Amino acid sequence: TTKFPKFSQALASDPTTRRIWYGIATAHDFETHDGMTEENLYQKIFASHFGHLALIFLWTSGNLFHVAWQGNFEQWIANPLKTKPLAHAIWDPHFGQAALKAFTRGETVANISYSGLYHWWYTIGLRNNVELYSGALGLLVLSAVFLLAGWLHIQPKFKPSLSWFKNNESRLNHHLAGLFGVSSLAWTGHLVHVAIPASRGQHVGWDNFISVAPHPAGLQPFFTGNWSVYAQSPDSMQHVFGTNQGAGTAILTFLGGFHPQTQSLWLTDMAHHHLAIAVIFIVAGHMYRTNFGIGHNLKTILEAHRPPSGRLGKGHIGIYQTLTNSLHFQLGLALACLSVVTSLVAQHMYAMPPYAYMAYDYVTQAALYTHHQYIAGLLIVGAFAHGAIFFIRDYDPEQNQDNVLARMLTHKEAIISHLSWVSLFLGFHTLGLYVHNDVVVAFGNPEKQILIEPIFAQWIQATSGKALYGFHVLLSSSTSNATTAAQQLWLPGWLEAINNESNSLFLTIGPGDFLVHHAIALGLHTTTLILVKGALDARGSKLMPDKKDFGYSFPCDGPGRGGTCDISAWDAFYLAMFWMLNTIGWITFYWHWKHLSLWQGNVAQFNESSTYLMGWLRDYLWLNSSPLINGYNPYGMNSLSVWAWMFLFAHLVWATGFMFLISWRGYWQELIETLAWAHERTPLANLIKWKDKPVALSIVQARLVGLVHFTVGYILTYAAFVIASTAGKF
Template sequence: MIDRQRTNHNEKIHFFGSSLNLLLAGLFVCVVRKEEDLMIIRSPEPEVKILVDRDPIKTSFEQWAKPGHFSRTIAKGPDTTTWIWNLHADAHDFDSHTSDLEEISRKVFSAHFGQLSIIFLWLSGMYFHGARFSNYEAWLSDPTHIGPSAQVVWPIVGQEILNGDVGGGFRGIQITSGFFQIWRASGITSELQLYCTAIGALIFASLMLFAGWFHYHKAAPKLAWFQDVESMLNHHLAGLLGLGSLSWAGHQIHVSLPINKFLDAGVDPKEIPLPHEFILNRDLLAQLYPSFNEGATPFFTLNWSKYADFLTFRGGLDPITGGLWLSDTAHHHLAIAILFLIAGHMYKTNWGIGHSLKDILEAHKGPFTGQGHKGLYEIFTTSWHAQLSLNLAMLGSLTIIVAHHMYSMPPYPYLATDYGTQLSLFTHHMWIGGFLIVGAAAQCSHFLS
């Protein structure tokens, strides 16, 4: 009797245990099914890519203080004077430091920021000379009779004989760089503004130095980042060219145009409102360009012709200044900003839509060369010499085009009548274009060797 009760009791436990297992199994299947259903309708989680290495290389002042630390041979010290020349020749010859493409890429990327820092420093010097040693304000009052000068030779052993009368009672060396003309075109009306811009350029030079250190020693991009050409194209087109052009167009519209309108009318530069007044006070701008009264309404209602008072398409040259109409150039920069912003969204990155450079190159079939572009993608993503060669050739050609256009269509006020500056700018851009194309051939030979 007891055994039968125990057996029944065990069967009940077994039954409840089996039922519980079945219930749990059923719940599990339901959860899995539900999870599968959710996985079907849920958008995939974005793939997080770590594209930088943190703190890859220690910052070492002791290493920097040792001449030639980048080369075992040079680091041994000088044997002959050749050591000095090798020190300078090899400091940035990154190919001789290492054969690791990622490390070379990081060094080149970091060096770019150093180069930008030097450019900002140079620009700061130009603006400082304009503020401290020039006759800019006098030239602004009479640009046809007073020559631009931003350098006065000190009277040391008779060297002051180099100074000449440039007009307006100012004695100095006449400059032919075109800076005065571009300053007027951008709406600079005082030497104080030149000082402020010079200080701003110094701040940016410091930021670039910091960025160069940061992106080599603290957060260095991986090789995959340098080889992600679609993302690079998108950012360079939309960011540098698109937003850069849009920023300049905004400056031209809100600052340059109203200030130049006053200058062309003969208003004393000291009487012209300051740039921030035009930006903050719309009524002030609306007195010169009535469409500003309507704000952004014409833009959103597609009634864009309302803005024709400051976004013009006149063509030709302004008869007062001899330069392109500044309202035409503002319109031009706004138009190319829109084009580049659109172009910066053309290439396939994270969303699976857009162009792929590799596909474009490999799909191309020329009438004579056939699949001549096949393999180019691999070349340009593994050889920076090949890529730089192509870029230099195109930039050099563009620079020569700029040389010809700057005298046929002078872009800045009173540039056309400053013949020395016209000749200098043409010669400068022709030489620079030639050097860039020679550099393209040199880089190509590096790639081929």
């Protein structure tokens, strides 16, 4: 604790540049820090959590403040379909005059926003820059508060005990009823009091919200139980959003489908959704036994779920202790569920646009889908990484004897071998069918293509009421008890939306959609295979039966026993990242091309070209690259210059990653030795001495540095393309 890093004496004693790198890379692995106790670990994490939350509120503050100060929110409200929202001003003294003009948006040099903040803020009732700014100040206070809380809870009297941190039943009650439930109840309050009034051109703010009742009938219906009153007189189908013209009085409805003007969910549906959700969460958070002698014990629930056959051995006996005592098990489950939520957000927000006019902001739609699927992809890789770490660091076989978790390890070869089978099957046949299609199309015979109708997915569209395919099942059947039950509620609005081919609600699907879905299945299964193999072999294999003794991350076990490069569970994380990027690539390529085709009104292009891979390269990548790569050229530059420059930058970063991934350490260490030699023997230069002996990056470090360049290049390349291709085209 007398040289960086203070938390590792083993690193601090390292006389080489490795000390600095490993200091940075291990700074947050609190468990492995010198003299770390379980109590200090939890308390450090809790305080770090306050830091991270404060960061989220400062970032959000920044976005509100920049739009308030430098944006065109007020001008965008006036004309949301034509006006481009501004992110923030550019001040760059490297700009030539031509670049200042190219990026001039009105009277300001500025970036256009593709984050959808204007659409969201406008939908939730924000109407002017002073309201945004008030938001910014409000969130600076929230940041400051969390920084105070963070600071308080690492002061001796305010450090919570380990028993506090392992109070599962209490945290679940509060998080369900309070964090989810009451937040959703309070948010309902915002929609009913502020957002819905704002949608009907009625200003409700801090100035008047005490006096201005969000419904004419007040709270008399709510206490008399005459709740139908709140659903009467919804906004007409002629309602001009932000105005009273065709406005209703309803605050809670079940209209289904879209506001025809804003092509977004009804605010009164979203109000009533959140009321329903709030109640479900408040009830759900009264499940678990705290201090009042009612509710469930989570251990008692788990221990009871042992099938009497003995087919799951001891069932869930021991799982309670295993989960409660492992932060990595907890982080794994949390990342797994959050990943799924992030993917569901991506899928549901494009299909059922919540925000006024954002269906028309094509760049924002594409940006948001892509952003969230890459976050979801990172989260699920992380979930499995912490699954693997859990197995090495926290899993005790003796405490999990013959339970569901121990039984996974018992048949790991059955699991891995079957994931291998499904991956091989999907890979052979998906690549096979695409290559069949490419060859017969290349030979001028597209009628010889294997074009398998996605009839199961088409049948599901028909169950939700899509008439197009000729199936008359459930909601697409007039006589179904499913149809008749919903006819007076959401079904008219929903059927209108689902049978409209202009929106993204249950897009029409054909053979193109069949093939890419099997590509997506291949990617999910293979990424899963790598991560699961990583987790189930983390503790040991036939090649390294004592792997758990070497920990999550180590270079290898040397060239003996045939050679052991990339044997650590960390190496499975490293390999899975490539497959995650590849898979999210296929997903987001598919989303983007399907939407470009829809938005152009040339669905036929996607339908015909998507069934062979040259179609993707030519009609998606090559065709849509033109606006991007002409951001600058010999004749001049335009506002896409920054995406053109970023695009090349990202290709460079991607390719630089290959150096670290392909060329390994020994080459570099030998080269550095000659440079050290040269420096010491060069006059004048040799008066200057390094304090840290320069060495080549470590074996694992280069995998990480290579993967970061690869990942950054991968993401920035696609970001520049998906933005510039969409912005350039519309």
